[PDB]
């Protein structure tokens, strides 16, 4: 906004985005599906939920 050899001035526009939480969850586990093998009419088959 101003530029002398002994003086300066600047302006900065900052925009912020604050997420407001509804609930916070701390003690958490990841799921790992393993399933089960089934041997049916000769064929081996992997079964999963």
């Amino acid at each position: 906004t101003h530029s002398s050899p002994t003086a300066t001035a600047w302006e900065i526009g900052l925009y912020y985005e604050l997420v407001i939480p509804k609930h916070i969850y701390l003690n958490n586990w990841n799921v790992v599906n393993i399933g089960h093998l089934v041997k049916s009419a000769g064929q081996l088959t992997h079964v999963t939920i």
């Binding site: 089960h36 089934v38 049916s40 079964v47």
Partner: peptide, 17 residues
Amino acid sequence: QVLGPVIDWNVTQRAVY
């Protein structure tokens, strides 16, 4: 149309000695 197998993830049930 026959009834098929049942699975219940019980290891103790499938023990072979």
